Amino acid sequence: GFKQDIATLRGDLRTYAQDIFLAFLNKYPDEKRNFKNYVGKSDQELKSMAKFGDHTEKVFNLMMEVADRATDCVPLASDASTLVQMKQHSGLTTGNFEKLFVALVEYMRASGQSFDSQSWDRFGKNLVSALSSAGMK
Numbered sequence: 001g002f003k004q005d006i007a008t009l010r011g012d013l014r015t016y017a018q019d020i021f022l023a024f025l026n027k028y029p030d031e032k033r034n035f036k037n038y039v040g041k042s043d044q045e046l047k048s049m050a051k052f053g054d055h056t057e058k059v060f061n062l063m064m065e066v067a068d069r070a071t072d073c074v075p076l077a078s079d080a081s082t083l084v085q086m087k088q089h090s091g092l093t094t095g096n097f098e099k100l101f102v103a104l105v106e107y108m109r110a111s112g113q114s115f116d117s118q119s120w121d122r123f124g125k126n127l128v129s130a131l132s133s134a135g136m137k
């Protein structure tokens with residue numbers, strides 16, 4: 001289930017973080033707008049960019065803690081509050097989270113592994129909704 005999925009992603013987090021984030025950028029190429037230095041690079045080059053590898057693991061480090069503190073795929077309102085505030089997110093929509101979660105779900109569904117894809121769908125939908133209540137456009 002969802003709890004074992006957090007343990008699975010954490011056991012190889014930098015490769016899952018990178019492969020899921022690349023799935024996202026490849027599904028939603030216009031999403032590179034928010035990351036201008038990622039444009040004009042393949043997946044093998046992005047992996048070679050220090051901040052790509054660092055930022056994508058740190059995103060995933062956070063997402064996995066929020067997942068871990070969730071109950072029944074419902075994040076802590078305190079965790080949506082932290083996210084909306086961030087600093088980087090000054091410019092960021094719930095749309096961009098929904099997109100990342102559509103990418104994450106398809107990646108899970110397409111893998112040979114027993115990921116609880118429906119739970120991740122639920123989680124993203126619920127994180128979006130909590131970000132929308134904590135004051136994200």
Ligand code: FDE
Pocket residue numbers: 031034035051055058059062063088089092096097100
């Ligand atoms: C679209 C999108 C989505 C997202 C999501 C997310 C989640 C879930 C979580 C997160 C977190 C974060 N962010 Fe985040 N995000 C985004 C975006 C971004 C950007 C653009 C930035 C800046 C950096 C770079 O990469 O360049 C960030 C960013 C970020 C960070 C750090 C890095 C810096 O800036 O310094 C962190 C930790 N973000 N995030």
Ligand SMILES: O=[N+]([O-])c1ccc(O)cc1
Pocket residue numbers: 021035051052055056059060100
């Ligand atoms: O997954 N994410 O939201 C990310 C991943 C990498 C990055 O540089 C910024 C945001």
